[PDB]
Design an enzyme around this catalytic site. Structure first.
Site, short mmCIF file in Angstrom:
data_model
loop_
_atom_site.label_atom_id
_atom_site.label_comp_id
_atom_site.label_asym_id
_atom_site.label_seq_id
_atom_site.Cartn_x
_atom_site.Cartn_y
_atom_site.Cartn_z
N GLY A 641 -40.98 26.39 -31.37
CA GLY A 641 -42.02 27.16 -32.02
C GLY A 641 -42.11 28.53 -31.38
CG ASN A 642 -43.37 31.48 -33.15
OD1 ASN A 642 -43.72 30.40 -33.62
ND2 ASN A 642 -43.36 32.60 -33.86
NE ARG A 1228 19.19 26.03 -14.82
CZ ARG A 1228 20.05 26.89 -14.28
NH1 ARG A 1228 19.85 27.37 -13.06
NH2 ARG A 1228 21.12 27.28 -14.97
CG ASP A 1265 3.34 21.77 -10.57
OD1 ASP A 1265 4.06 20.98 -9.92
OD2 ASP A 1265 3.69 22.24 -11.67
CG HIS A 1269 11.25 23.60 -13.12
ND1 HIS A 1269 12.52 23.61 -13.67
CD2 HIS A 1269 10.46 24.29 -13.97
CE1 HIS A 1269 12.49 24.27 -14.82
NE2 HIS A 1269 11.26 24.69 -15.02
CG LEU A 1272 11.35 30.75 -9.85
CD1 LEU A 1272 10.66 31.77 -10.73
CD2 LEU A 1272 11.87 29.59 -10.67
CB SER A 1565 29.36 18.24 56.55
OG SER A 1565 28.24 19.10 56.48
CB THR A 1566 31.87 22.09 53.38
OG1 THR A 1566 31.40 22.55 54.65
CG2 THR A 1566 31.83 23.25 52.39
N1 ATP Z 1 11.40 35.49 -13.09
C1 ATP Z 1 12.29 34.53 -13.42
N2 ATP Z 1 13.60 34.64 -13.08
C2 ATP Z 1 14.49 33.69 -13.41
N3 ATP Z 1 14.18 32.57 -14.08
C3 ATP Z 1 12.91 32.34 -14.48
C4 ATP Z 1 11.87 33.33 -14.16
N4 ATP Z 1 10.72 32.86 -14.67
C5 ATP Z 1 11.00 31.67 -15.25
N5 ATP Z 1 12.30 31.36 -15.14
C6 ATP Z 1 12.96 30.15 -15.66
O1 ATP Z 1 12.63 30.00 -17.03
C7 ATP Z 1 12.33 28.64 -17.34
C8 ATP Z 1 11.09 28.57 -18.20
O2 ATP Z 1 9.95 28.70 -17.36
P1 ATP Z 1 8.49 28.47 -17.98
O3 ATP Z 1 7.47 29.12 -17.09
O4 ATP Z 1 8.55 28.77 -19.45
O5 ATP Z 1 8.38 26.87 -17.84
P2 ATP Z 1 7.19 26.07 -18.57
O6 ATP Z 1 5.93 26.89 -18.47
O7 ATP Z 1 7.22 24.65 -18.07
O8 ATP Z 1 7.70 26.07 -20.10
P3 ATP Z 1 6.72 25.60 -21.28
O9 ATP Z 1 5.58 26.59 -21.22
O10 ATP Z 1 7.57 25.72 -22.52
O11 ATP Z 1 6.35 24.19 -20.90
C9 ATP Z 1 12.17 27.91 -16.02
O12 ATP Z 1 13.18 26.90 -15.95
C10 ATP Z 1 12.44 28.92 -14.94
O13 ATP Z 1 13.44 28.43 -14.05
#
Ligand code: ATP
Ligand code: GDP
Length: 1795
Positions: A641-642, A1228, A1265, A1269, A1272, A1565-1566
Site C-alpha cells: 500500500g502507501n 598433448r 582448475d 591442459h 601452455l 707412524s707416518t
Molecule cells: N595463447 C594460446 N597459445 C596456444 N594455444 C592456446 C592458447 N590459448 C588456448 N590455446 C589452446 O586452444 C585450445 C582451446 O582452448 P579453450 O580455452 O577454447 O578450451 P575450452 O575453453 O575448454 O574450450 P570450450 O570453451 O570449447 O570448452 C586449448 O587446447 C589450448 O591448448
C-alpha cells in the site's frame, strides 16, 4: 728551458725541510713545456706532494705509453692521490684513464719479469674500480675497443653486463662493432639477459659473420644435455650450415689455457682490494626450424661442413615456414630421419621422393597447397611409414598408389581436403586411425573398408554422407558428426567392439534401444543437434551399464524415461536446450557418477540455480524424491500500500481475526510477517498455508522492501479508494516495483474503502493500468475492509483460486513435489520457533545441526545448504548465505522479529541538535547485540543513513559544462524503482580506489553523489526530469577526458550489474506489443561542439548496431562525431588504453579452420598482430558485450611472466587477442612427445606454474582448475626465460560469471565433496597432482582415460600410488617429499604456494638423482663403483659395524642390499681392477689384519689371499699404466708404513702375487692415508699420494721425484691444522690438501711447491650460518672438518664437511658457489662415477644419526647414500640467474599496469 733545474732543486727541497701555491705552477709548467721526458718525470714524481690534475696526468701517461719507468712514477702519483682522496678516480675514469691503464696491463707484461710494476698498477686499478658504477662504465669503455683480456678481467670483478641501455646494451653494440668472437663469448658466458641476445642475433644476421652467430645460437638454441636445437621462434630469414657448424659436437675440440692471464690479474686486484679493505659421439638429433620464415632450404642440400652430422638427425621440424620443393639431395643425405613434419609451408606438390628416406615415420605435410592429385611413384617402397598426415590441402582424389607403397601405414590422415568422388577400395593392411573429415564426400564404395581389418578411429566429419561401407569388426572409435544422416545405419549397429560414436548435427529420427547395438562396451554416445523424439530404453537397459556420456541436447525430447537410473556408470548427461522436458524422473538419483548436468534453456519441476545447483545437488534432490516425496503447501501473499490503506485492517478480516482486541492500531514498522493456514473444508484436503507480509507504506522504509519481494508470491494491492482516481496514479510506483522485482507474479488490486463512498475509477484502472508495462493484473475488488461481507468473502475465494492456479511455466507452484526431508525440517523449525529467546531468536548452525541429530532426519552436511535455502524461499526462516556478509552462521527463525529490528533505526529521529547534516549519523545506542545490529544494517547497506537524507538536491557547479567536454547518458525509465538509489549510491560509494588509493571529497544527497577528485575527474549521477516528461531521467555527467571515461564505464557497469541483479523485469524485452524495454538508456551528443542549443537523443541499442564503422554522422554527412566521444564504454576505450584492437595491423582470417590449429575444433585461432604471431579467441554470441567488458577489466591487470598476458580486445567481431603458446598445451605434449621432457624442463615447468600460483594467491584469487591442459608451454629449450604459462582466461570467466568444482581427476579432496568453501590450499593440491603427472610423464592421465571412475576416486583421498613403483621413471626423490607434502588431506597442512615455490627454487632439488637408505645401523667407510659395465653399476661397500671383515654388495637400479662376510678384520678401503681379457673386473679387500684379499665380481668364492703386508692397509688405486706398447695396469697398495705394493693387472689372479716394486716411503707412524693421480694424461699419469704429513709424487719410475713437506709452513696461523695427518690430495694446476680435523685446505703447487692458497671452510659456513643458526653462538668449538675431496673436471671442487654440509668451490675465479646442508650428518666418503649411460654422477656416503637413545651413549646411525648430478655447480648459478631474470621481468610487467 730552465724548468728542469728548477724542478730538480724543488724535488731536493720538498724532502728535507718538510716543505709546505706551488702546485699550480708545477701543473702549468707541464703544459708550457710538454713532451719533454726529462721534466715529465720530475714533475709527476713531485705531484705526489680542479680536474686539470687528471687532464694532464692521463694525457701525459698516454703520450708516454711505454717509454720507461715514468709510468711507474705516474702510477705512484695516482696511488698517492687515491689513498687520501679516493673520489678522484671518478674524474680519472672520466677523462681518459682506461686508454692508458688497458695498454699498461696489456703491454705484454706477461713473459716480462716486471712484476714489481704490475703489482703497483693492479693495486691502483683496484681502487679505481671501487665504485660499482665506475666498473660498469670501465666495462662499457672497454667493450668498444676490442680488448678480450681486460673485458674478462672486468667481468671477474663483478661489473654486470646487462645495464647499458636495455635495448642497445653491451652485446647489442658489441655485435655491430665487428668485435672478436672471444669478446662476445665472455659477455654471453657471464650474466646477460635473453631479450638483448635475441636483438643482437638479428643485427649479426644483417652482417655475414660465421662465428658471432654460431656463438649467439649456442646460448640461444642448444640443449646439449638433450641433444636438440630449439631454433624455433627466431625470425632468421635464412639458414646456413656455417652457422650450425660449431653447434654440432665433435670430439677433436681441445684447447690450451691462456685466459689464466685474466685470472691472475683479477686475483691480484682482488687481493689488493681485500688487503686495503680489512686492514683499513653424442650426436644431437632434434633439429627445430619452425618459425624461421625460410623461403627455401637449399643451403643445406650441398656438401656442407655439417653434411656428416645430418646422417643421425632422427627428427627435423620445418612447420610454419614458407618453404617449397624439399631439395632432392637433402632427403637422401639424412638416412635416419624418423620424424619429418613440415606444415603451413607453401608447397605445391607432394615430392613423392620424400619416401625414399631409409627409416622414416610420421611424415607430416598437413597445411600445404598440394595439387589435386598426389600420385605416388609405383616404384618407391617405404614400408616404414606410420602416420601419413595430409590434412587441409587442396586434394581432389585420395592418394593414388597408397596400397603398394606404404603397407605398414597406421594413421592416414586426410581431413580438410576436397576429396569429392566416390572413393576407391584402399586396401591398406594396418590402418588404425583413418580420417576424412571436412571433405566433400557423398558416399563410400561399399568395399572401401572391407579390406582394412584393423581400422579403429574412422573419423569423417562435416561430409555429405548417408551410408557406411561395412565397417571392419575391429572398430573402436567412430566420429561421423556434421554428416547428413537420417538413421543410424545397420553398419554401425553391428560393430561388436564399438566404444564411441560421435554423430552430432545430423537430422536423425530414431535412436534405437540397447537391443540393437550388439556391442557390450559402449562408452560415449554423442547425439546433439538431432531431431530425436523418443529415448527408447525400457527394452533392455543393463546392456548400457557402461555408457559414460550421453549427449542428447537440442533434440525434440519430451520426457526422460525412468530406466535412465540403470546406467550407473553414466558420467556426463546432457539434455539441455530441449525446451520440452518440463520434468525430471526421480530415478536419476541413482547416477552417483554424474558430475556435470547442464540445465540451460529448460524449465523443470523445482527451483534450481540458487547459488549452487552444480549438478551434484540435483542428484541428491532427485534421489530424495525417490525415497518419499510429499506435496508442499505454502505460498507468500505479499500486501502493498502507501502510508494509509486497508493493509493491517484488511488483513485482520482476510484471516478472520475474531478478537481484534487492539482497540486502535497504529502505522506499521517493517513488514509484520504473519502466517495463516486454510484447511479447505472441501473434497480436496489441500491445506495450503500462505504467509502474508503486510508491508509498511510509510515513505521512509521503502529502501528495505525490495529485499522481501520475491517471485514466488501473489501480491495484493490496496488503493484507499477514498481518494478516487487520484491514488490509482499515486499507487502506480508499487505496481511498477512489483513488475520490476517479480515480473511473473500476479496482482490483485483491492480498492479498500466503500464504507466511505466515485467508484468510477474502474475506467482508469481498466484503461491506463492493465496492459501497459505493469504486471499481470488478475482481478480488482472493492472490499470494505472493516467487517465481513460477501465482497470480502469473494476476495478470499479469489485469493484461493489464484493461488491454487499460479502455475508459472505450467508448474502449479502451490502443489509441486519435494522430498520429505524438507517438510520434516519445516515442521521441526516451527516446533522450535517456540523455544528461542525473544530478545535474540537467532540460531547458530551448531544448534540446528544438533536439532537434526535429536530427530532422525537423513540430512547430511551436503544436504542442509539446500534445505535451509528451500525453507528460506518459503519465508519460514531467514538465512543469508552471502559469504561477504560474514554472518552466514546465523539462522533467523521467526522473521517477524528481524524485520521489525532492521526497521527500528529508520524511525527513531532526534528532536535535539542538528550538528550533522541530515542523513549522516554516528554510533549512538544491548549486551554485544548493538554491534551485530549495525553489522547487519551495513550488511543491508542501510548504514550514514541513505534513507532520510537531504531530498533537496544542492546546486553543484561543475567546472566544465561547455557541451563538448561533458559526456552524458540519460537513463529514461518510468519511475525510480523502490530501493534504487539507496542501492545505487551504496555501490558507487564503496568503490574508493578509482583511477587505479586517493579518495575524492563527495557530497551526496538522496538521489545523487558528485564525487570529484579534481576538475578533470568527477562524476555527477544526478536525478532530474525534463519538461513535459512523466518519466524520471538519470543524467550522468563526466568530463570527456580519458580519465573521466573510466568513471563513466565503471558507473554504467554498476548501474547495469544492479538492474539485472535486482530488478530483472525492467530490462526484459516485452516481445508482446513492442520491445519498449522499460529502460531507454539514451545517449546525448551534439555535432556543433559548444552552443549547439541541444544534445540529440540516440538510443544506445540503435547506436550499438552502428558499430560496423567508428564514426556517427547525421543524414548530412559532412560533419561527424567519433563513437569514442559519446559512448566510450561500447568501444573498449575506458579500460587501459593499450588494449584497443587496432584492426589495421591485425592480420587474421576466422573463416578457415586450418588456422584454428590452436586446439582441436575449439574456438581460439592463430593469427598475426604487430607483425608478430598471436592467438585470437573468437567468442560466440553468448557473451554479451557487458560481460566481456566485465571480464576484461579484471584480465587487464594481472601482468605476470607466468600468465597469458592480454594484448588487445575489440569488436568486429567480438575477439580477444592473447599471447601464442607455440608448443601448445602440456597434455598433448606428454601424450605424444614424451621423449622431450628432460628432468630439467620438467622442473622449469613446475617452477613457472608455482610462480603463477604464488602470484595469483597474492591478488587473493584461486585458480580452481589446474590441469595439464591449462599449462601452455612456449619452448622446449630448458634454460630459457619464459617456458610455461597457465591460461588465465578461466579465472576471469569465473569471477565474472560465477566447472567451479574443477575437472574430476585434477581435483582436491575438499573440492570434490563441495561441503566447505575452498581456499588457496586447493590450487596447491591440484598443483601436486600436476607435479605427479609431470614426474610420471602422464601415466595417470592415459590410464584414467579408460578408468575415469578410478581416475578420480583413487585420488579423491590422498591415496595415490608411488610414482616410481607403478610407472617407470627416474626417482628424483627430493620432490616425492614435496608431493607427499602437497598431497595431504588437511588443507592447512599443505604448504602454501609461497613455500611450494621457495622449496622448488632450491637447486639441490633438480640435481639429487636418488637417495638410497642403507639398512639400519650399517657402518661403511669405503665404497667403489663399477664402470666397465655401462648397462648397470654396483657399489661394493665395506663394514664398520663389525670388527670382522665383511663386504657389502649393493646394486643401484634394484637397491638390492647383499651382505657377505668375506674376512675376519675390519675393512678400510677398496679398489676395482678390471682385466680387459676374460671379461671380468676383480675386486679387492684391504683389511686391517694386513691380508690383501681379492674376490671376483661374479663368483663370490674364487677368493685368494695376496701377499700379506705389515700394518693396516689404508688406501688402494687402479692405474692407467700402459707403457709397454700395449694395454697394462697395476694396483698400488699403500700400507700404513709407506711400502707401496705395486702389482700387475693380470698377476693379481695369482695366489699371493708379486708386489712388484715395494718402496718404504715413510714410517709406520707416518701412515699413508691417500693416493691419487694427475688430472690430464699428457704428463703420463703422474701419481700424487699423501703420506702422514709427507706429500710425494712419481711416475712410471715409481720413485720419489718430489717429497714436498706441508707441516713446514711459513703461513702459521695454527700448527695442528698443518701438523696433522693428511687425508686426501687432488692433482690439478694446483695441489689441494686435506688433513684430519683441519677445517682448512692448503692450495699447493707442483713446480714452486708453495702455499698458493689457504681456503677456510667456516669462512664460508659462518657467513650463512649467522641468522639461521642462533644456537651456534655457544658452538665456538665448531664441528665441520674436511673429510673428503673430489674434483669435477675443471669447473668446481666439492668439499665434504665433517658435518652435514658440502661445499661447491669454483676453483677458477670465485670461491663460494653454494652450501648444501641438511641432507646428511657426515660426508664420510665421496667419489665420482658413471651410471648407466648417464655418466658423471657424484656419489656421497652421508650419515644420519638421531639422538633417540643418546642417553644410553648410543647413536642410531643411518648411512644415507645419495647420487648427485655432477652438473650441479652449473645448475645452481644458472637457476640463480633464471630467477633474477624473471623477477626483473615481473617488475617490468608490473610497470606496464601503471602506464
Ligand atoms: N595463447 C594460446 N597459445 C596456444 N594455444 C592456446 C592458447 N590459448 C588456448 N590455446 C589452446 O586452444 C585450445 C582451446 O582452448 P579453450 O580455452 O577454447 O578450451 P575450452 O575453453 O575448454 O574450450 P570450450 O570453451 O570449447 O570448452 C586449448 O587446447 C589450448 O591448448
Ligand atoms: N473508517 C474506515 N477506516 C479504514 C477503512 N479501511 C482502513 N481504514 C483505516 O486504515 C488504518 C489502517 O492503517 P494502515 O494504512 O493499514 O497502516 P499501514 O498500511 O502499515 O501504513 C486503520 O486505522 C483504519 O482506521 C474503512 O473501510 N473505514
Amino acid at each position: 728551458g730552465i724548468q728542469k733545474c728548477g724542478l730538480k732543486v724543488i724535488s731536493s727541497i720538498v724532502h728535507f725541510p718538510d716543505a709546505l701555491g706551488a702546485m699550480d705552477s708545477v701543473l702549468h709548467t707541464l703544459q708550457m713545456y710538454p713532451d719533454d721526458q726529462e721534466i715529465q718525470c720530475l714533475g709527476l714524481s713531485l705531484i705526489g706532494y680542479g680536474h686539470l690534475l687528471a687532464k694532464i696526468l692521463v694525457s701525459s701517461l698516454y703520450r708516454f705509453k711505454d717509454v720507461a719507468e715514468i709510468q711507474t712514477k705516474g702510477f705512484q702519483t695516482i696511488l698517492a692521490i687515491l689513498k687520501l682522496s679516493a673520489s678522484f678516480s671518478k674524474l680519472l675514469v672520466h677523462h681518459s684513464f682506461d686508454l692508458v691503464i688497458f695498454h699498461q696491463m696489456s703491454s705484454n707484461i706477461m713473459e716480462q719479469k716486471d712484476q714489481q710494476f704490475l703489482n703497483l698498477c693492479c693495486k691502483c686499478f683496484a681502487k679505481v674500480a671501487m665504485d660499482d658504477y665506475l666498473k660498469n662504465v670501465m666495462l662499457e669503455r672497454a667493450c668498444d675497443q676490442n680488448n678480450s683480456i681486460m673485458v674478462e678481467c672486468l667481468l671477474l670483478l663483478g661489473a654486470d653486463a646487462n645495464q647499458a641501455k636495455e635495448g642497445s646494451s653491451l652485446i647489442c653494440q658489441v655485435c655491430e662493432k665487428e668485435s672478436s668472437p672471444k669478446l662476445v663469448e665472455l659477455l654471453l658466458n657471464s650474466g646477460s639477459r635473453e631479450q638483448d641476445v635475441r636483438k643482437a642475433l638479428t643485427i649479426s644476421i644483417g652482417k655475414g659473420d660465421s662465428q658471432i652467430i654460431s656463438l649467439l645460437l649456442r646460448r640461444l638454441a642448444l640443449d646439449v644435455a638433450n641433444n636438440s636445437i630449439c631454433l624455433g621462434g627466431f625470425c632468421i630469414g635464412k639458414v646456413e650450415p656455417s652457422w650450425l657448424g660449431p653447434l654440432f659436437p665433435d670430439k677433436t675440440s681441445n684447447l690450451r689455457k691462456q685466459t689464466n692471464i685474466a685470472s691472475t690479474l683479477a686475483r691480484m686486484v682482488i687481493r689488493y682490494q681485500m688487503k686495503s679493505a680489512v686492514e683499513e659421439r653424442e650426436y644431437i638429433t632434434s633439429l627445430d626450424l619452425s618459425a624461421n620464415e625460410l623461403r627455401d632450404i637449399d643451403a643445406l642440400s650441398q656438401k656442407c661442413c655439417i653434411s656428416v652430422h645430418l646422417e643421425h638427425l632422427e627428427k627435423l621440424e620445418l612447420h610454419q615456414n614458407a618453404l617449397t620443393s624439399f631439395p632432392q639431395q637433402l632427403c637422401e643425405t639424412l638416412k635416419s630421419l624418423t620424424h619429418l613434419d613440415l606444415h603451413s609451408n607453401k608447397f605445391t606438390s607432394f615430392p613423392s621422393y620424400l619416401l625414399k628416406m631409409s627409416c622414416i615415420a610420421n611424415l607430416d605435410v598437413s597445411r600445404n597447397d598440394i595439387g589435386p592429385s598426389v600420385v605416388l611413384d609405383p616404384t618407391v617402397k617405404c614400408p616404414t611409414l606410420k602416420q601419413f598426415n595430409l590434412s587441409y590441402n587442396q586434394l581432389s582424389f585420395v592418394p593414388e598408389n597408397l596400397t603398394d607403397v606404404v603397407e605398414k601405414l597406421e594413421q592416414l590422415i586426410l581431413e580438410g581436403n576436397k576429396i569429392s568422388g566416390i572413393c576407391s577400395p584402399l586396401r591398406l593392411k594396418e590402418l588404425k586411425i583413418l580420417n576424412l573429415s571436412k571433405n566433400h564426400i557423398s558416399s563410400l564404395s561399399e568395399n572401401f573398408l572391407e579390406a582394412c581389418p584393423k581400422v579403429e578411429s574412422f573419423s569423417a566429419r562435416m561430409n555429405f554422407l548417408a551410408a557406411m561401407p561395412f565397417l571392419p569388426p575391429s572398430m573402436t572409435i567412430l566420429k561421423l558428426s556434421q554428416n547428413k544422416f537420417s538413421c543410424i545405419p545397420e553398419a554401425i549397429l553391428n560393430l561388436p567392439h564399438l566404444r564411441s560414436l560421435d554423430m552430432s548435427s545430423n537430422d536423425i529420427q530414431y535412436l534405437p534401444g540397447p537391443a540393437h547395438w550388439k556391442s557390450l562396451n559402449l562408452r560415449e554416445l554423442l547425439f546433439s543437434h538431432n531431431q530425436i523424439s523418443i529415448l527408447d530404453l525400457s527394452e533392455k537397459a543393463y546392456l548400457w551399464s557402461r555408457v559414460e556420456k550421453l549427449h542428447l541436447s537440442h533434440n525434440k525430447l519430451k520426457e526422460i524415461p525412468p530406466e535412465i537410473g540403470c546406467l550407473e556408470n553414466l558420467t556426463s548427461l546432457d539434455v539441455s536446450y530441449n525446451l520440452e522436458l518440463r520434468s525430471f524422473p526421480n530415478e536419476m538419483g541413482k547416477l552417483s557418477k554424474i558430475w556435470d548436468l547442464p540445465l540451460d534453456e529448460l524449465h523443470l519441476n523445482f527451483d534450481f540455480k540458487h547459488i549452487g545447483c552444480k549438478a551434484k545437488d540435483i542428484i541428491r534432490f532427485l534421489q530424495q524424491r525417490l525415497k518419499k516425496a510429499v506435496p508442499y503447501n505454502r505460498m507468500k501473499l505479499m500486501i502493498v500500500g502507501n502510508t494509509g490503506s486497508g493493509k493491517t485492517t484488511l488483513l485482520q478480516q482476510l484471516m478472520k481475526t475474531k478478537k481484534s482486541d487492539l482497540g486502535m492500531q497504529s502505522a506499521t514498522v517493517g513488514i509484520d510477517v504473519k502466517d495463516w493456514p486454510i484447511q479447505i473444508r472441501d473434497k480436496r484436503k489441500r491445506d495450503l498455508v500462505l504467509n502474508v507480509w503486510d508491508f509498511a507504506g510509510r515513505e521512509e522504509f521503502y529502501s528495505t522492501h525490495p529485499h522481501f519481494m520475491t517471485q514466488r508470491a501473489l501480491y495484493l494491492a490496496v488503493y484507499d479508494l477514498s481518494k478516487g482516481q487520484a491514488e490509482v496514479d499515486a499507487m502506480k510506483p508499487w505496481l511498477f516495483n512489483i513488475k520490476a522485482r517479480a515480473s511473473s507474479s500476479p496482482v490483485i488490486l483491492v480498492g479498500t474503502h466503500l464504507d466511505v463512498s466515485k467508484a468510477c475509477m474502474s475506467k482508469i484502472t481498466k484503461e491506463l493500468l492493465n496492459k501497459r508495462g505493469f504486471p499481470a493484473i488478475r482481478d480488482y475488488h472493492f472490499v470494505n475492509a472493516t467487517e465481513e461481507s460477501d465482497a470480502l468473502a469473494k476476495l478470499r475465494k479469489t485469493i484461493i483460486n489464484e493461488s491454487l492456479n499460479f502455475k508459472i511455466r505450467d508448474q502449479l507452484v502451490v502443489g509441486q513435489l519435494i522430498p520429505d526431508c524438507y517438510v520434516e525440517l519445516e515442521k521441526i523449525i516451527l516446533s522450535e520457533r517456540k523455544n528461542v529467546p525473544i530478545e535474540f531468536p537467532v540460531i547458530d548452525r551448531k544448534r540446528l545441526l544438533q536439532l537434526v541429530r535429536e530427530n532422525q532426519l537423513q540430512l547430511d552436511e551436503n544436504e542442509l545448504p539446500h534445505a535451509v535455502h528451500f525453507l528460506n524461499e518459503s519465508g519460514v526462516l531467514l538465512h543469508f548465505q552471502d559469504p561477504a556478509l560474514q554472518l552466514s552462521d546465523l539462522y533467523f527463525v521467526e522473521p517477524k522479529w528481524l524485520c521489525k529490528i532492521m526497521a527500528q533505526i529508520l524511525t527513531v529521529k532526534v528532536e535535539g541538535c542538528p550538528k550533522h547534516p541530515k542523513g549522516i549519523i554516528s554510533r549512538r545506542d544491548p549486551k554485544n547485540y548493538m554491534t551485530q545490529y549495525f553489522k547487519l544494517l551495513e550488511k543491508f547497506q542501510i548504514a550514514l543513513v541513505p534513507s532520510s537524507l537531504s531530498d533537496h538536491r544542492p546546486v553543484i557547479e561543475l567546472p566544465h559544462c561547455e557541451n563538448s567536454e561533458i559526456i552524458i547518458r540519460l537513463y529514461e525509465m518510468p519511475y525510480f524503482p523502490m530501493g534504487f538509489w539507496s542501492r545505487l549510491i551504496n555501490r558507487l560509494l564503496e568503490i574508493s580506489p578509482y583511477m587505479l588509493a586517493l579518495r575524492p571529497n563527495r557530497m551526496y544527497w538522496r538521489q545523487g553523489i558528485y564525487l570529484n577528485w579534481s576538475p578533470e575527474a568527477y562524476c555527477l549521477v544526478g536525478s532530474e526530469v525534463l519538461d513535459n516528461h512523466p518519466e524520471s531521467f538519470l543524467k550522468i555527467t563526466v568530463p570527456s577526458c580519458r580519465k573521466g571515461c573510466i568513471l563513466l564505464g565503471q558507473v554504467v557497469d554498476h548501474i547495469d550489474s544492479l538492474m539485472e541483479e535486482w530488478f530483472p523485469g525492467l530490462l526484459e524485452i516485452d516481445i508482446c506489443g513492442e520491445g519498449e524495454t522499460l529502460l531507454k538508456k539514451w545517449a546525448l551528443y551534439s555535432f556543433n561542439d559548444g552552443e549547439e542549443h541541444q544534445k540529440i537523443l540516440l538510443d544506445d541499442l540503435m547506436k550499438k548496431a552502428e558499430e560496423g564503422d567508428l564514426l556517427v554522422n547525421p543524414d548530412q554527412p559532412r560533419l561527424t562525431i567519433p563513437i569514442s566521444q559519446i559512448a566510450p564504454d561500447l568501444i573498449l576505450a575506458d579500460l587501459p588504453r593499450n588494449i584497443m584492437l587496432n584492426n589495421d595491423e591485425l592480420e587474421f582470417e576466422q573463416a578457415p579452420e586450418f588456422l584454428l590449429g590452436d586446439g582441436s575444433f575449439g574456438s581460439v585461432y592463430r593469427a598475426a598482430y604487430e607483425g608478430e604471431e598471436v592467438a585470437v579467441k573468437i567468442f560466440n554470441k553468448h557473451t554479451s558485450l557487458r560481460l566481456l567488458r566485465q571480464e576484461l577489466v579484471v584480465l587487464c591487470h594481472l601482468h605476470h611472466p607466468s600468465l597469458i598476458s592480454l594484448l588487445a580486445a575489440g569488436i568486429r567481431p567480438r575477439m580477444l587477442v592473447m599471447e601464442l603458446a607455440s608448443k601448445g598445451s602440456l597434455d598433448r605434449l606428454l601424450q605424444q612427445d614424451k621423449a622431450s621432457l628432460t628432468r630439467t624442463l620438467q622442473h622449469r615447468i613446475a617452477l613457472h606454474v608455482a610462480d603463477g600460483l604464488r602470484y595469483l594467491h597474492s591478488a587473493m584469487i584461486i585458480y580452481r582448475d589446474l590441469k595439464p591442459h591449462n599449462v601452455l608451454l612456449f619452448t622446449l629449450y630448458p634454460n630459457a626465460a619464459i617456458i610455461a604459462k597457465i591460461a588465465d582466461y578461466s579465472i576471469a570467466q569465473y569471477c565474472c560469471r560465477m566447472t567451479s568444482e574443477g575437472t574430476p581427476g585434477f581435483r582436491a579432496p575438499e573440492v570434490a565433496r563441495g561441503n566447505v568453501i575452498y581456499n588457496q590450499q586447493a590450487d596447491v593440491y591440484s598443483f601436486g597432482l600436476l607435479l605427479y603427472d609431470i614426474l610420471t610423464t602422464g601415466g595417470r592421465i592415459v590410464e584414467g582415460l579408460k578408468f575415469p571412475n578410478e581416475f578420480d576416486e583413487l585420488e579423491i583421498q590422498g591415496k595415490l600410488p608411488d610414482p616410481v613403483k607403478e610407472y617407470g621413471c627416474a626417482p628424483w626423490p627430493m620432490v616425492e617429499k614435496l608431493i607427499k607434502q602437497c598431497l595431504k588431506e588437511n588443507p592447512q597442512e599443505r604448504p602454501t604456494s609461497a613455500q611450494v615455490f621457495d622449496i622448488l627454487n632450491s637447486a639441490e632439488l633438480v640435481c639429487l638423482t636418488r637417495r638410497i637408505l642403507l639398512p639400519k645401523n650399517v657402518i661403511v667407510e669405503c665404497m667403489v663403483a663399477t664402470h666397465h659395465n655401462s648397462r648397470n653399476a654396483s657399489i661394493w661397500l665395506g663394514c664398520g659395524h663389525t670388527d670382522r671383515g665383511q663386504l657389502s654388495f649393493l646394486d643401484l637400479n634394484t637397491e638390492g642390499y647383499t651382505s657377505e662376510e668375506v674376512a675376519d678384520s675390519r675393512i678400510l678401503c677398496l679398489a676395482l681392477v678390471h682385466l680387459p681379457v676374460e671379461k671380468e673386473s676383480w675386486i679387492v679387500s684391504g683389511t686391517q689384519s694386513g691380508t690383501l684379499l681379492v674376490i671376483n665380481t661374479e663368483d663370490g668364492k674364487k677368493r685368494h689371499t695376496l701377499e700379506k703386508m705389515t700394518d693396516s692397509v689404508t688406501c688402494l688405486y687402479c692405474n692407467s699404466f700402459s707403457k709397454q706398447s700395449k694395454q697394462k695396469n697395476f694396483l698400488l697398495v699403500g700400507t700404513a708404513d709407506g711400502k707401496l705394493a705395486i702389482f700387475e693387472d693380470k698377476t693379481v689372479k695369482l695366489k699371493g702375487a708379486a708386489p712388484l716394486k715395494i718402496l718404504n716411503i715413510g714410517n709406520v707412524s707416518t701412515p699413508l692415508m691417500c693416493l691419487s693421480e694427475s688430472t690430464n694424461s699428457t704428463e703420463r699419469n703422474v701419481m700424487w699420494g699423501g703420506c702422514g704429513t709427507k706429500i710425494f709424487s712419481f711416475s712410471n719410475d715409481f720413485t720419489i721425484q718430489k717429497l714436498i713437506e706441508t707441516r713446514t709452513s711459513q703461513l702459521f696461523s695454527y700448527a695442528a691444522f698443518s701438523d696433522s695427518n693428511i687425508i686426501t690430495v687432488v692433482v690439478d694446476t694446483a695441489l689441494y690438501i686435506a688433513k684430519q680435523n683441519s677445517p682448512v685446505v692448503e692450495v699447493w703447487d707442483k713446480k714452486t711447491e708453495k702455499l698458493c692458497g689457504l681456503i677456510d671452510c667456516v669462512h664460508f659456513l659462518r657467513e650463512v650460518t649467522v641468522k639461521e643458526n642462533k644456537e651456534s653462538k655457544h658452538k665456538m668449538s665448531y664441528s665441520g672438518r674436511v673429510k673428503t675431496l673430489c674434483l669435477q673436471k675443471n669447473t668446481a671442487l666439492w668439499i665434504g664437511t665433517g658435518g652435514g654440509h658440502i661445499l661447491l668451490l669454483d676453483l677458477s675465479t670465485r670461491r663460494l658457489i653454494r652450501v648444501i646442508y641438511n641432507f646428511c650428518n657426515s660426508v664420510r666418503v665421496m667419489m665420482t662415477a658413471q651410471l648407466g649411460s648417464l655418466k658423471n654422477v657424484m656419489l656421497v656416503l652421508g650419515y644420519n644419526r638421531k639422538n633417540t637413545e643418546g642417553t644410553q651413549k648410543q647413536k642410531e646411525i643411518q648411512s644415507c647414500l645419495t647420487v648427485w648430478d655432477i652438473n650441479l655447480p652449473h645448475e645452481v648459478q644458472n637457476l640463480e640467474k633464471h630467477i633474477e631474470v624473471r623477477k626483473e621481468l615481473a617488475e617490468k610487467m608490473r610497470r606496464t599496469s601503471v602506464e
